[PDB]
Design a protein around this ligand. Structure first.
Ligand code: MG
Ligand code: MG
Ligand code: MG
Length: 309
């Protein structure tokens, strides 16, 4: 009795082993192979965060748990998950071609980044749709953003609540919550890109839900290009806020990210921690969603709402 549908889960992508660093970053750098020192530095960062093998596995687990959960919570549709990536195989186009080959004629897609941007989400969605158009006989309805799904907001609200409950009374009263996402070039403003506004809205929703009156919005992990990227960067924001008001604890919620990848494990857990240790403040960074049941149910709800179910 069920209708079969493809579930196209898209993501930035991550290397599978250390030997993939070169090609993964060359792709990210638009064809410019990292110099030897940079290649070695990257290997060192990945070693520091515990290894590469767990990275892509989280993403795989997210798509797999999402598929099974969607299949268990409703009885009209049977979903088959397909992972499509931007910077390493399986690429977005490979996944759509596989759905077509397997006989899928109808699919719903969702990107594993909650905020919409012209730079990433819009482009991922456009690519998936152009491949389906090229092949024919297959259509895709794509989720554009989901940062405002209540269940997702609640996930972070409750992790933030636990973190503040865990602090000594003196920290609890002199803490600063920093909500961030991946920085992008400021030129996206030329298109009226809502990306910045959505991150600020996530920060408002989370702080408000957790009853946090002192918070700030920051960006992290910017690429190196001659044109300016969205700021302030979390490292600078932390120091400036400390110099101006003397906060004793900083809590980082990298809401734009959904997994324990390099951006969180190194750019927050190491780079932000260097700063907090330098100023004598405590560092807190609540658990990323990863493939936990609570997150998977939030994503399932986002997908069913998009299909009017
Ligand atoms: Mg090896
Ligand atoms: Mg919306
Ligand atoms: Mg960096």
């Amino acid at each position: 009795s069920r209708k079969k549908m493809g579930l196209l889960v898209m993501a930035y992508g991550t290397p599978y082993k250390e030997e993939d660093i070169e090609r993964y970053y060359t792709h990210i750098r638009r064809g410019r192979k990292p110099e030897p020192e940079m290649l070695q530095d990257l290997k060192d960062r990945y070693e520091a965060i515990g290894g590469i093998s767990p990275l892509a596995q989280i993403t795989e687990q997210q798509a797999h748990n999402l598929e099974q959960h969607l299949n268990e919570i409703q009885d009209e549709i049977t979903f088959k998950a397909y992972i499509g990536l931007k910077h390493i195989e399986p690429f977005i186009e490979d996944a759509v071609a596989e759905m077509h080959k397997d006989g899928i004629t109808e699919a719903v897609s969702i990107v594993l980044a909650p905020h919409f941007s012209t730079f990433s989400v819009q482009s991922y969605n456009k690519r998936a749709k152009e491949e389906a158009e090229k092949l024919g006989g297959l259509t895709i309805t794509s989720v554009e953003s989901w940062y405002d799904e209540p269940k997702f907001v609640t996930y972070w609200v409750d992790r933030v609540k636990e973190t503040y409950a865990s602090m000594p009374e003196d920290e609890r009263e002199n803490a600063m919550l920093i909500v961030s996402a991946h920085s992008l070039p400021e030129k996206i403003k030329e298109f009226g890109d809502p990306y910045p506004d959505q991150l600020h809205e996530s920060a408002k929703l989370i702080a408000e839900g957790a009853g946090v009156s002192e918070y700030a919005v920051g960006w992290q992990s910017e690429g190196n290009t001659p044109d300016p990227w969205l700021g302030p960067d979390v490292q600078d924001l932390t120091r400036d806020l400390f110099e101006q008001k003397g906060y004793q604890a900083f809590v980082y919620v990298p809401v734009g990210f959904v997994a324990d990848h390099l951006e969180v494990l190194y750019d927050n857990d190491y780079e932000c921690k260097v700063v907090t240790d330098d100023i004598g403040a405590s560092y807190y960074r609540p658990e990323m969603p990863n493939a936990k049941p609570e997150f998977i149910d939030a994503l399932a709800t986002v997908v069913l709402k998009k299909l009017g179910r």
